[PDB]
């Protein structure tokens, strides 16, 4: 089960977001910049199973349900995708991860002078996106470990230190609500 709770916004549109009981959060958004908002660990693991159910995944727009988190040394932002809203989100392509029923695409990408968690840097970003929007409503499992390990296998080793390790509901340029439960 969970311990950590994250709720980031840029300050731009309206971003309400609940931590209710256990692993369970809810979040509403109208015309939001960025955010992102979830449940889950204060430290990531390399090996942690996670499982989550979205009651509800309902963006007008851009948004993404993902297993999210970062490393440091190197500062390494990752994502791993199961639904997205109006644009799925691609970078560098690297090949494809099969794991927990579902085939991701592999990407990278750098972001320069972004926000991250050590400030402003100019970081790297791992991505797994699921190739289909993965369903909604159901009890979902994102086995981690298959997702570093082929990250490995691409050239994308990740941190040493490995900070918060969420289930993360992020928006971008949009409105919508999400209900999510993390365990």
Known sequence: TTNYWQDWTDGVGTVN?????????????????????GKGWSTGSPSRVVNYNAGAFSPNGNGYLSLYGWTRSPLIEYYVVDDWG?????????????SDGGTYD?????????????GTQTFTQFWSVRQSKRSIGTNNTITFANHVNAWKSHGMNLGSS?????????????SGYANVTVW
């Open 86 to 98: 109006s644009y799925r989100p691609t970078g560098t392509y690297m090949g494809t991860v099969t």
């Open 17 to 37: 977001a609940s931590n209710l009981a256990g692993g369970q959060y809810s979040v509403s958004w109208t015309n939001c910049g960025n955010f992102v908002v």
């Open 106 to 118: 592999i990407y990278t990408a750098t972001r320069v002078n972004a926000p991250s968690i050590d």
């Open 162 to 174: 490995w900070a918060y390790q969420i289930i993360a509901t992020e928006g971008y340029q949009s």
